[PDB]
Structures are given as C-alpha cells and as structure tokens.
Design a protein around this ligand. Sequence first.
Ligand SMILES: Oc1ccc(Cl)c(Cl)c1
Ligand SMILES: Oc1ccc(Cl)c(Cl)c1
Lengths: 168, 168
Amino acid sequence: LEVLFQGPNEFETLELEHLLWVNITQVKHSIERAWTRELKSLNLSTEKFAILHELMCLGGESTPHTLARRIVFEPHSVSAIVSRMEKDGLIIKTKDLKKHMVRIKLSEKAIDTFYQALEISNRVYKQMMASITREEKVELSKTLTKLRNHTLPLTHKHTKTLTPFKYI
Amino acid sequence: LEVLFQGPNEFETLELEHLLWVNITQVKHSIERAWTRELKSLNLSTEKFAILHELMCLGGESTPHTLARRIVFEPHSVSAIVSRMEKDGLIIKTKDLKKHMVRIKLSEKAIDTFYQALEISNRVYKQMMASITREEKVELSKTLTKLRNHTLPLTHKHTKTLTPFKYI
Ligand SMILES: Oc1ccc(Cl)c(Cl)c1
Ligand SMILES: Oc1ccc(Cl)c(Cl)c1
C-alpha cells in the first residue's frame, strides 16, 4: 500500500541547534510578512520602523555612529536605510556646524508616522503571539537573550551598546 | 552627581511581544553573522546553504515550485538565490522535455560543498548555543514552533508545506 523508497532521507533529521536556526528564521519571516502587510499604508518596512524607533529613543536626533552602536544591524545597512528614509522625508540630515560629521533628525512627519505605527504594531504583535502564554513569552525572551549575549561578541567586539529595552 | 533629564524615555519600555520581535531579530542577525564568517571559504550565504539543504532533502533534483513550497522564503527570493547558485555552478537548470517547466539539479560540486558545509555548520551552531541547556533548547523549539504554526497561515494560505525536519 504505502509506496517504497519515498520517505524522508537523512538530511531531514538535524542537530537540535540547526533546527533552532531554522525555527528562528521561520518565525522571523512569518511574523514580519504578516506585520509588513498591516503596516503597508504607512509605507514602513521592519527596518525603517526599527530605525524610527531607535531615533525616538534617542530623542529624535543623533548621528550615524551613535545610531549604529545602538542597533544590531550592520553600519552599511543602517546607512542605506537612513538614505531611503531621507528620500521618504522621514529623516533630515544636516552638516554639523565638526567638518564631515552629519546629524540625523526625524521630521515631525516621521514622528507622527511613528505615533501611528507603534499603536498598530503593538496590536499586531499581541494578536500574533496570543497562542503562547505569558510564561512561555517570558522564558522565550530569557532564552533568546542568553543566546544573543553569547553570540553577539563573537563578531561585534565593543562595537554595539544595544538599546536596553525593558518590558513590565 | 547623576546628571538629570538624560535617562531613558518611554520608547525604551516595550510590550513583551514587541520585545520578543527585537530578541528574534537580534539573535538571527548575531548567529548568522558569526556563521557566515566561518563558512566564507565555501562562499555560502545562509540562504544559499538553506536552498542546498532543501534540494538535498529532495534528492538533489526538483522544480522551482516544489522547492518554494518546502521553504519559508518568498518565491521571488527562492528564484533569485537559485539564479545566483546557477552562476556559481551549484545548480544546473534544464528544460523539462512540459513546455516552460524548468528542472533544477545540484551539481556534484554543490553536493560535495554541502558535505563540507553541513559538518562545519553543525559545529558552529553547537558551539554558539552551548550556553543554553538541552532543556532550554527543547522548549525554545517548542515555543518557536507554536509561533510559526500560528503566524505562517496569516499570510501563507496553503502555499507552503514546509519540510518536516526532526531532531533526536
Ligand atoms: O522596534 C525595533 C527596534 C529594534 C529592532 Cl532590531 C527591531 Cl526588530 C524592532
Ligand atoms: O538549513 C536550513 C534549511 C531551511 C532554512 Cl529556512 C534554514 Cl534557515 C536553514
């Protein structure tokens, strides 16, 4: 009845640490694809929202090097996102009055967009994660934080001082 | 002594579900940046390795639509990666003898590269995740699997039948 010689091969059984990498990548892709569609009317990708958010934690005004230190992304990535946001009218760049240093500031459009995006974003993430309990969320953050603290220094050696986000 | 009016503002305190999104994104970026440097001698990015791996689970030979169904990535992404791998000599594309259907096959170079990459990749992930216990790994996979199962159908409605990876 069942056909022979069809069933899965050895490459479908993974070490648990490799399966964890597949699980992390699948959840990041799934939760971001659903969030990006709900934020479409504000024309915000996940990385434009993360840079908006970091600049709101910095009081709406910083420099490229301080913004890069606070976020996980690579500096060339941070710069490309900031350029796209400058073209969208979300960031104003001005020369520091320090030769070659740039200051980056959110426009009041960007701050009002962040107004709107944070409220939608909070509902989206709450509905997405309603199938895990408060306890499972707290433990997931703790485990992921352990992994981030072990692994970020393997390639970022004093170059990041990531924003110390809290929850209650 | 401590300066006044400097400490963090309200945007540094998040809802736990938003902090979980930041934690997922930070761990994915940290573990991938360290893995990509160790795999550099094989010229494999994370997505070229994931497509190599999926095609090894499919017996080294499939079609673009079957490969896309098995992996989380978007089809245009899968196609762009497959094109880059065709240029690297990792994938051979041949016309099905079905007008307009393409078959994609790994070259024996690609299979030998996967030989080497899986062994390095397993050590890299084992060393990276040595700071969490077996129990914390098992629970992390379970929680992430719950989140993936809740959230993938919000935007992928019968378009994926993801490879059912196991661990022991
Ligand atoms: O709101 C944020 C802030 C930083 C990051 Cl890395 C992310 Cl994913 C979302
Ligand atoms: O080895 C793999 C297979 C699929 C995915 Cl999505 C990943 Cl991240 C790694």
